[PDB]
Design a protein around this ligand. Structure first.
Ligand code: CA
Ligand code: CA
Ligand code: CA
Lengths: 595, 595, 99, 595, 50
């Protein structure tokens, strides 16, 4: 007989497709996650117990030097993370001692006590235990060990964050302007004096380190990411400052119609359906930074809820300063930047990936696209990968590495350096970190003294704390990896698969140095969609660093993790279509995968 | 021994969760879809063949009376829909005869020939064959048979659409104003003269008909939907006209901060992260309707691509007229309205469903929400259900019912009534539909004569065509059900499950009758989130009817279908969480399901 | 009892040997193939479309500079490669214009 | 829903294709193999034990009459065959008594002792237990029982073999020449005096016997096989004597190019890529036959390793005599003849089977062939079937029938006839065989006496042994079936499926009677590819008979077994292609199967 | 110039160094650079029957 296949009922074929996808996912294998070993390394000299200084302990009661008071509070917290039991999380110790009549926390700072602040809790500390109906399971993927406190890498990461905090009110369009030369030149020479940047990796180093190690800092790569496309052209992705084509501009047969609102494109207006999105961001008070006083910093480490304490100027403007990019990433919904990028691309008519079905003229294939392979498809797909990626990064954040946020590291530096001047030893583990950042810390103590004077906040010693752009500092979850960066990675992977990513963009804009408007850039162009989508991912991720809440390595590693999650979802979803097609996807490493 | 369970590796538990969800879906069963029987009922008197006049045939070559020329073109189109083969879809007959030198279509109207229009193709005619990794399979659910051309129901649906087209430039806030009394009163008395509205269902009628049958028309229910909440208060949902709370307004312990941009709330500004969405919509030229001339209408039925031919006024305004709601639903991304509603709810601090985990103060449960049970969760979930719902409605649209769009029905009415005045019989099947709409058709012929004069479009006879708000008329896919309404249904089901849906809204706004601004309504309130989310679903769905592209029954039935799709996804996803919780969901029928 | 193995018919043993080898091959895993990214990188200046100058296009109609005339001819070629359908291969454009 | 099939991962589909093939093979069923019953029939008069005279016992110690000395040696040998255990094989008794001082075997003949010959071992006695990844398992197929020593069929087979040995230096082209008429006519007459050939089968005879029984011997069928095509035209297949078209001969559009080496085609040069294969074979010394002396014969049955002892004339020539065909099959690689034919067919441009995919002009199908359905595919397939066919004949040879080689049967005849001349009875079971061959034996004793005189070998009595063309006689494995003929059957089956087997060959060549060159034959032609490929299989298989190492029945039965093995491989491999096609295969029985 | 740390491993494995007459136009499989350019197996004959 002739070899054949049999049909089955529709219901059974649907069931079998779901199982087959599940089998695909199971066959990929699971990789183990290794942490850097710091967790139990650092010990308390007096008791011999682990001090947990290189670990996330925000929320647990701390002592005056910023170390937790009771190691059992951290060990109970870890057990709670790994079980996910709601009652167990409710029995944890959160916040400082409470007053017997008020029942309210007793804070160290006059500021926190005068506001009657209450405590805030951990955000989804067991989201990494949750399964998902599509994509790689959260625990099946891994991020490599984070940099340790005594490494050249961390030294360079902290130097870069302190300089971003001192240069927060510098305008992106004026990086090469004579008014900022003293700061820019001193920033670059200080970073180029650190071994991470001025010496190459050595044979024998871990591959993950070799891939994220950076070379010589220049004005052209200062504070930028390293995804392909991020170092070409202006700092800011076109997609976070320009508008789109507007309703009313169309080509109808041989006639060209011009929208009566066409100028909105060049004024940061994205056409969103029949309404609009404005790219202008709220303006946080220039020059006002937070958590520059030791007692307020310790209250925030002990959970004081300072959310919502920032002050703003009236109006809005196109992103101008480093601070505005920090403000943008303080409140964005997590797929916001990529959904807005997508809307510009749809409104501007950028073509879909030419390997998708039915992209030719309708006269050749009789089939337009929308639900599948069209705008509705990409609009749901870019947003749905976000929670799958977050589940994976929550497993890394809480269940595996528990890396301390940058503000805690600045806490360790401030305490050690102040003890040193009083001829005392506190946190000897950061002695080399403090010695190598010495000229940077002198500038920061002087900037923090002005901030503390202006706020009327007094604490003993100089303050070498890292100035935060946000009143509450970082969110209530560990630093490695990052929710913004994991989502960026997954979302721009979907968009580069769905759109013709190498299509060129010929109009390059930047924000004017004098007015709140867009001007033609001096960079000729063209740029490609892929490089400006990669740039946008880097802008949102590095924005979190500019706010003081992540390190470089958190961002870069999380971008790669989100990329894997997105690729995994597309592969499993490929079993559902009967058409003959594939997604052409340019990865962050420069190679292409066809799915 | 003591009875127990065993653990398994994480990978295997993830695989087993996916299979278990697949088994849940398989156990729900699949229901058959029945069509109304019209497809092959209507015959051509001369050949005896099926004429397909009650079927969607947009794109296939039509004769001068609007009937397809060759029945085989429709029969080949059906085969192509059911196979999904790309080459088979490419071999179909699309558009009219082409000119041998140009290769361009030969149109009937001077307008289409003067623009050199080309053809447009069908949009995803086989999307209903696609499987999905989550939720009910597209073919496992059903929509009941659509109303037939000779039924009282269709008569009332067409009367309502012609009156919406004549009242397109009437303002929602002026429905009860003396300047519109002659039109409003005549609209209500004519609709109340039709049996659908003035006589109740009879024992023995199909249950689906009894559920969507409407009673007496009044100013308070005129042009409204029937979801619970839609008939209370102002016509327009608060969520499509107001803004939200802005960044800078916060309560920090005992101190209340006021945003310097707080007034933006009351000016239609939604806080979107740190940027904004404006609720003001583009303004289509008032009084300009389309496809009111027979030859241009036949060219559009033969696929002439008129997309992008509308003209607009400069600027934007809060939705004011029926036409503006049509313009809003011409270009919205499909989950746009619900994502914007969600952003208002998050920015205003409306509480999440109190049965979700960790909603108490952090001091009682030590756990904030974001990834799971928080904003990121609902923001991905509301958008991801959209493509699952569209797959189901595409199966109904193309594979089962293939209902003709309202413009084709107006085509049948115009041809029959013109033949009748010349003592001739064309399409006798609509004789009763034409007789019962007689006074309405007199008003419409007079409005269409003015439109055709203004455009310089000439065709023999009077024009009783349904005026379209869009130059191209309906999209290139059948009328029953609707993509907008199926998505509305699924998306507001997710939001009413995730948010505390019965929470009350005490500030009720409407659009001012004199200026482009929001004013306090005369309706006292309060309203609930569920009723205003249901209203919003009805506003977007009924907006498609106001544009002339759907009937009432298309919308209502599609809302119920999307609701089922959403409930199915939530049930399957409930197997992934280890927490103890459930979604409390108020359905469109007034009952609650806990998931 | 003493641990043992059982014999089976020859035919079964032959069947089980072929299945065991298929299982060994399945257990090796499958690795993905990544391409260098050139295919869609190079663009035609006038139209903005991919020019495919870094890709095999032997057989498709070329212009006087050696670049393919129509990008759709390459895209249809790639679809036909991935499906293997004989009729789809036969409908491709091969060679220059004919007399 | 619409019935459907689901996709699965590539890996999973490969795994299910291999399982499906295995299932196909299991579903064919396995047939038992029946032997002829002789193994244990013959008994030793003195002890009553089985004597094993009708079984292969080469290698086991024999007595002076050629019977094994100890029956336990044969029974241990059978156990070793069935287990395959290497140690058990190593513990068997091989060769004669050895000298305590030298360790060397003690032989009977001066010749073997003077050369210090060592023993040679059984070749792969348990290759019939090996499984395979493709095709019918080796024990799943069967050959029918072999002819018994006292049958008419064996009498006929031995008469033919003795006549082949006496005619070894006769030229194929001079079969009907007056110089050979005394020998040819007496050969025909003596074969036509035997019942097997002069009397037809009778109703009730086993069907396998009816199919291989031959009729009246003529010059046209003398020494030929019975596959369709072997009796048409010249004795030797064109593929073992002609060369092929050479590089440089081609048609390029309208221009015909002629190779500068075109004449090579008619001089026996096959184009092998860019180098050549010569059809001229080494020339074994004319008139020199082996094992014509009783003692040397006994040493050979006792394992004396005489391999490599033949002498040759300088140079090479196109196959000319029966001896040259025997020389050809002495050392050929087992698929050599069929690969060489395949190369001739590819170089001459014979078409592939027209039912294969893509064989039309490239302008009609856009697809040339090579890997699949082209030259690389058939080049690997024709050679890979060889080891699968050998495993099955190994099971037949050792595990089932264990048929004595023709040389052993000649030893029985010689011993019995000499005992009779001396008034003694030895091996009474072959009395009838000896009586019916009486005239042939007289000629053979006379030729054997000349051979022994020329070699200086002396043994008591006349010699009626079967003169061997090879010094070592047969290979170290049983006679039924044959490795050359099982491979011939499988390999030509593959070639007839892959090429257009009925294409005609119009140029027919033969080897010249006077010179070493090809001449146009007197047979007009045409011949077909199928007929000449079947003829080639018969030429190689009957050349083994010409050497004295096989009987007729061995070859014909093995050709049928090889055919089945090849068919089973094609059927299992048909599950691996997605194309629509099939192999048209003309079988040895005249019918065609489509796979 | 040699490969650099950070380059793809597949590139490091096939990168070739300084060209000499001894390696000109040769492959890099072990044994290809020893002795004559052409393998013995593409020029020599074999032992013959006899
Ligand atoms: Ca298209
Ligand atoms: Ca809480
Ligand atoms: Ca061909």
């Amino acid at each position: 007989g002739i070899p054949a296949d049999n049909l089955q009922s529709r219901a059974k074929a649907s069931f079998d497709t779901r199982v087959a996808a599940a089998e695909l996912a199971l066959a990929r294998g699971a990789v183990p996650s290794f942490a850097n070993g710091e967790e139990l390394l650092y010990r308390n000299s007096e008791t011999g117990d682990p001090s947990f200084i290189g670990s996330f302990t925000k929320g647990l009661p701390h002592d005056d030097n910023g170390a937790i008071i009771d190691p059992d509070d951290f060990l109970a917290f870890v057990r709670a993370i790994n079980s996910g039991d709601e009652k167990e999380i409710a029995a944890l110790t959160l916040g400082p001692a409470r007053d017997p009549e008020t029942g309210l926390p007793i804070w160290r700072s006059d500021l926190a006590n005068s506001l009657d602040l209450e405590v805030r809790g951990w955000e989804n500390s067991s989201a990494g235990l949750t399964f998902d109906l599509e994509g790689p399971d959260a625990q099946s993927v891994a991020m490599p060990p984070a940099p340790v406190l005594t490494s050249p890498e961390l030294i360079a990461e902290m130097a870069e964050l302190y300089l971003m905090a001192l240069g927060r009110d510098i305008e992106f369009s004026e990086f090469d302007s004579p008014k900022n030369a003293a700061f820019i030149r001193s920033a670059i020479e200080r970073l180029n004096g650190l071994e991470w940047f001025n010496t190459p990796a050595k044979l024998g180093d871990p591959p993950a380190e070799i891939r994220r190690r950076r070379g010589e800092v220049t004005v052209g790569n200062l504070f930028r990411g390293i995804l392909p496309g991020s170092e070409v052209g202006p700092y800011l992705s076109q997609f976070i400052i320009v508008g789109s084509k507007q309703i009313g501009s169309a080509t109808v047969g041989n006639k060209t119609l011009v929208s009566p609102n066409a100028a909105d494109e060049f004024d940061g207006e994205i056409a969103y359906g029949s309404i609009t999105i404005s790219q202008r961001v709220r303006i946080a008070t220039p020059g006002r930074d937070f958590m520059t006083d030791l007692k307020v910093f310790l209250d925030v480490q002990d959970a004081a809820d300072f959310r919502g304490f920032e002050s703003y100027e009236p109006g809005a403007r196109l992103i101008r300063t480093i601070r505005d990019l920090a403000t943008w990433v303080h409140f964005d919904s997590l797929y916001e930047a990529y959904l807005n990028a997508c809307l510009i691309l749809l409104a501007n008519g950028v073509p879909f990936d030419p390997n998708l079905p039915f992209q030719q003229e309708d006269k050749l294939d009789n089939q337009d696209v929308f639900v599948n392979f069209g705008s509705a498809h990409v609009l749901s797909l870019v947003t749905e990968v976000a929670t799958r990626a977050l589940k994976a990064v929550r497993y890394q954040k809480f269940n595996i590495h528990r890396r301390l946020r940058p503000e805690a590291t600045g806490g360790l530096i401030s305490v050690n350096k102040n003890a040193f001047l009083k001829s005392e030893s506190v946190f000897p583990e950061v002695d080399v970190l403090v010695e190598e950042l010495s000229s940077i810390l002198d500038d920061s103590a002087s900037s923090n003294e002005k901030q503390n004077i202006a706020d009327g906040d007094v604490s003993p010693g100089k303050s070498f704390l890292l100035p935060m752009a946000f009143a509450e500092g970082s969110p209530f979850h560990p630093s490695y990896g990052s929710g913004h960066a994991v989502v960026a990675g997954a979302c721009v992977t979907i968009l580069k698969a769905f759109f013709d990513a190498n299509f060129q963009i010929d109009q390059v804009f930047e924000v004017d140095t004098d007015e709140d408007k867009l001007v033609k850039s001096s960079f000729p162009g063209p740029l490609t969609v892929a490089g400006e989508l990669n740039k946008l991912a880097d802008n949102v991720a590095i924005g979190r660093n500019m706010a003081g809440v992540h390190y470089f390595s958190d961002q870069f590693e999380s971008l790669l993790l989100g990329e894997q999650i997105a690729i995994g979802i597309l592969e499993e979803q490929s079993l559902t279509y009967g058409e003959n097609f594939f997604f052409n996807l340019p990865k962050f490493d420069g190679t292409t995968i066809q799915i």
